[PDB]
Each structure stands twice: as structure tokens, then as C-alpha cells.
Design a protein around this ligand. Structure first.
Ligand code: GDP
Ligand code: GDP
Lengths: 253, 246
């Protein structure tokens, strides 16, 4: 069982930190693009985590689109082989793209609108507000609204969690309500009541990553539920990869 | 007595909020300005804000040059009255660096390098409540290191006069200033930025360097910034223009 996550955003926006927080694990990244492959034990999940720093508005997202196209191409070439073995092929197709929006507190940059528009039919895009401890509660409500307004206005097809299966439709419907996720990451941890907890400690107080009243990290983490990973994978295989495949089959003649 | 402040940085980085915090006044502002008559210490200020993003720093250089040009044209007039002329030359530029936590952006080096002989540049770390105290030390160190290795002439408060050397040496030690701006007040009367996990007190030297930045407004420091604007930066402009004009 594979799960492939791509994080996109400007340098120092907190992408690597969020991945480590999400999996509670320091990752040794390897070669503006880097990736790690990591096995979860007792979960039977093989992860490929990929990080891409963005900065020529259309050129900005090109390296990301190319990476994505390449994982599709590798899978297509395997499907087409006479002597194929689809089990034992490592499927690296990107199941989810976390798009990191900087916390200016204003709105979506024009560059981010173009990027998410170019990605929408290539990958399941989930926009997140990076370093959301930067923003006060009232500023955040307004910021989230304006971002959503622009996504809707520009007809950008971001991912939505499935709400069809009655349980847990509840969990999923509330996740959708929180998009774009206000995320906080941290390498720093303290033991609290015998439990390991990630925090950002300032002179005036500490942001608790796993506290839902501080940020949406706990809501983002529910994407890792088996049912949600499956929906993201199925949508990748049956929709985005198929779009790629159809265009390629025409080109191959 | 006039004092003219320019804030430069990317949109939404806290420029207008910081001006409001510096002067404890809500202001109603490409580039925008406001004129503030600080009847406190009898000073008229022009506060200018320019949104950036080598062509990137151009609107700023042009703005600065235009104030120099107006002053020069006045100095050259047959019927001149230099007193009661409104000097709008920029006395200090607060250059906002984004709190990424890593280093100085290449764009910022180029911008500061271009501005160094046009205006007194003071780099500030915007929204410094974004950064923990431990990373903030390293971040400041890395910025200063790039500024020095790139031979960038940022402003330094004067320390040759004992009447102010203690205050000003402490100021210099905190550059680039870790700033935080505020639009709210609590009882605790305290100006704050309030989060669920605690409140930043902008006027508290343990939370940020706002109180240190504010000492720029001491009479002696405004005077030094002005004198250097007039005797150094304006002269550099003047000499070039006199060569051009013949
Ligand atoms: N305020 C804040 N800072 C963060 C957060 N996440 C990471 N940082 C800091 O931002 C800096 C860059 O983070 P990093 O994960 O390397 O950024 P990347 O270049 O996007 O991979 C580091 O100093 C982090 O400690 C966050 O959620 N809030
Ligand atoms: N975290 C943080 N946010 C700030 C600070 N100062 C201002 N803000 C917020 O940043 C957003 C944009 O600030 P603003 O002053 O209008 O930026 P400007 O475009 O550069 O003039 C607003 O939501 C402010 O409330 C600060 O020191 N720290």
C-alpha cells in the first residue's frame, strides 16, 4: 500500500517541518526538489514524500507539473509493457498536493491562483495556510474566507473529502469546512502527561500543534485515515492519471 | 523640524501597522503617504510606504531621487526661501525582511545595496513573533553576516557622544530590529497582539525590539539621521546632477 504526498511552496514556508510533524519523524531528505521514501510499520504503508520550492508566473509551477507528469509516465509505461508486473512496480504517482499559502493575512497571491489552476486536473490539491500561528483568530477567519472566495471565483477545483459514506461523513464534512487548513509545524517536543507533544515555544506562550483551538493540524492529520488515503488514491488513479493517459494515448498513436 | 520615514517591503508584511504602532495613531494612507503633525515634540512627519514586488527597488529609488530633485531645484532658484520650504527628503528607510527563519533573500541584498548611498537604511525583521527566540538569534546573525560580506552600508546610530552612547550602542546591537506591530490594547493599559496561547506585548523588550526601534525618534537621533541625509546622501545626488546640468 503506497501513499505519495507532495508539498509545494516558497523556501522556508515550513514544508519540511510540517511533514516531520505529520509523521512524527525526522526525515533525511535527498535530491529545488527533494524526496524521501519512508515505510510505516504496522500500517503497511510505503510513503514517498516530495518537497518542491517555488519562486514568470507560469514557469513557477512547471517543475512541479513535470515531476507529476513523470510519475504518471512511469506508471503508463509499466501498464503498457508486454511482460508487466504491476505488483512489484513502485507506484510513485502523487496522491495529494499540499499547497502552502504564505500568511500575509490579506489574500491569495496571483501566483498561487495560477499554480493551483494548473495543478487542479493533475493532482488532488489541498491548500494550507502556512505558519498559521502568525495570524490572530479574527484575522484568520477573514483570511480563510477571502482565499475560499478567490478559489470559487476563479473556478479552481481543489480536493474535497468524500461525504457519501454515512460514517464518518461527519468527520469528513468538518474537514472540508476547515479548508484551507491553518497548519503549524514543529521539530520541538515536550512530554506532557506521559505523551509526546509538538510545540512552538515563545516568551509569551506555547502553540500546541495537536490542540484544535490553536490550529487545524489535527484536522489535516485525519487525511491519513485509511478511508481518506483510499479516496485520494482512487481519485488519483481513476481521474487524474486517466486524464494524462488519454492525452498520451493520442500522442503515441 | 521635519522628519521623513520610508517603509519598504512586500505587500502585507506589516508596514502600515508598524507605523501606526511607532506613533500610536491610526493612519489613513504602489506607494502611499500620510503627513503627521506630532505636536508632542513639534515635528512634522511624512510617512511613506512602498510595496515592492534589480528593477524591483526602482519605484523606491525614483521616489527618493524625486525628493532630492525638488530640494535641489529649490536650492538653485534665484528667489529662494529654504526656510519654509517643505523638505521631503527621506531621512530613514525601514527595510522589511520577511521572517522565513533562514537567511536574507537575494532580492533584499540587491535592494539594500542599491539604497545604501541614497538613504539611511535600517533593516527590520517583520512579524518577528513568527520566530522563536533561539532561531531569531541565529537568523539575525546570518543576516548581519550577509550584509557585511556584501559590503552593504546600513545605518548605525552615533556613539561618539557620551550623552547618547549607551542608548545608541544598545540600538546598534539589536539591528536588524525584531519588530512586532499592534492594533489592540488590554488592561493587564498594554498594547498587544493577542493569540489563544498568549499575548505579545510590543512595548516589552523581552518580546521584541520595538522599544529599541522607537529610540530612533529621540531628538538627537532624528537630528543625526537628517544631518547624514543632508550632508552625505543628498550631496552624492547633488554632485551627479551638477555634472549633468553643467
Ligand atoms: N512560526 C512558525 N514557524 C515555523 C513553522 N513551521 C516551521 N517554522 C520555521 O520556519 C523555518 C523553515 O521551516 P522549514 O520546514 O525548513 O521550511 P521549508 O523550506 O518550507 O521546508 C524553520 O525555522 C522552522 O522552524 C510554523 O508552523 N510556524
Ligand atoms: N504576526 C504579525 N502580524 C502582523 C504584525 N503587524 C501586522 N500584522 C498583520 O499583518 C497583516 C498585514 O499588515 P499591514 O500592516 O496592513 O501590512 P502592509 O501591507 O505591509 O502595510 C494584517 O493582518 C496585520 O494585522 C506583526 O508584527 N506580527
Amino acid at each position: 500500500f503506497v501513499f505519495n504526498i507532495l508539498c509545494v511552496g516558497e523556501t522556508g514556508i515550513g514544508k519540511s517541518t510540517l511533514l516531520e510533524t505529520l509523521f512524527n519523524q525526522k526525515f533525511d531528505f535527498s535530491p529545488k526538489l527533494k524526496a524521501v521514501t519512508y515505510d510505516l510499520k504496522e500500517a503497511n504503508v510505503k510513503l514517498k514524500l516530495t518537497v518542491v520550492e517555488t519562486c514568470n508566473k507560469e514557469n513557477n509551477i512547471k517543475p512541479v507539473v513535470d515531476y507529476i507528469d513523470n510519475q504518471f509516465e512511469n506508471y503508463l509505461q509499466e501498464e503498457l509493457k508486454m511482460k508487466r508486473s504491476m505488483q512489484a512496480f513502485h507506484d510513485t504517482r502523487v496522491h495529494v498536493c499540499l499547497y502552502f499559502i504564505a500568511p500575509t493575512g490579506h489574500s491569495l497571491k496571483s501566483i498561487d491562483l495560477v499554480a493551483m489552476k494548473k495543478l487542479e486536473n493533475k493532482v488532488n490539491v489541498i491548500p494550507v495556510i502556512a505558519k498559521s500561528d502568525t495570524i490572530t483568530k479574527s484575522e484568520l477567519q477573514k483570511f480563510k474566507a477571502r482565499i475560499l472566495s478567490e478559489i470559487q471565483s476563479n473556478e479552481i477545483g481543489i480536493y474535497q473529502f468524500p461525504t457519501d459514506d454515512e460514517a464518518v461523513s461527519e468527520t469528513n464534512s468538518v474537514m472540508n469546512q476547515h479548508i484551507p487548513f491553518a497548519v503549524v509545524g514543529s521539530s520541538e517536543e515536550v512530554k506532557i502527561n506521559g505523551k509526546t507533544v509538538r510545540v512552538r515555544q515563545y516568551p509569551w506562550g506555547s502553540v500546541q500543534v495537536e490542540n484544535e483551538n490553536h490550529c487545524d493540524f489535527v484536522r489535516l492529520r485525519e487525511m491519513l485515515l485509511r478511508v481518506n488515503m483510499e479516496d485520494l488514491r482512487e481519485r488519483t488513479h481513476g481521474v487524474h492519471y486517466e486524464t494524462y493517459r488519454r492525452q498520451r494515448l493520442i500522442e503515441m498513436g
